[PDB]
Design a protein around this ligand. Structure first.
Ligand code: NI
Ligand code: NI
Lengths: 70, 70
């Protein structure tokens, strides 16, 4: 709990759970206000919208080649 | 109600009432999530932060050379 850091900020109103892909060092999360699932590097450099036109994403998890979401 | 337009969007979360200075043609509004009062031209071009470190702005009005906020 020492080195606090802000990785991503902006249009993240109504954020949902955050998921880490350890094998790829990639963060995945869902934004309900825009209805998208975004991903980005752990260093806070890259960010892109991965899935569009969702209603209310609640859960998401990365395993092998796939992202599962509820 | 004909020509709908978006002037400003960004770090507005807990947006409060808007107000207009007709003589100078600049909009004023307050953002509670950041505790600021901002200005902007009706053209939607110039935007800046006018007051800092507010707690929960509720009302504001511009008359003459002064701006009143509660
Ligand atoms: Ni939710
Ligand atoms: Ni309020």
């Amino acid at each position: 709990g020492t080195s606090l850091k802000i990785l991503f900020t902006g249009n993240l109103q109504h954020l949902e759970v955050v998921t880490l892909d350890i094998q790829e060092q990639k963060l995945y999360w869902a934004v309900t206000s825009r209805g998208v699932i975004e991903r980005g590097n752990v260093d806070g450099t890259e960010r892109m919208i991965l899935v569009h036109h969702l209603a209310h994403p609640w859960g998401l998890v990365v395993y092998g080649s796939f992202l599962y979401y509820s």
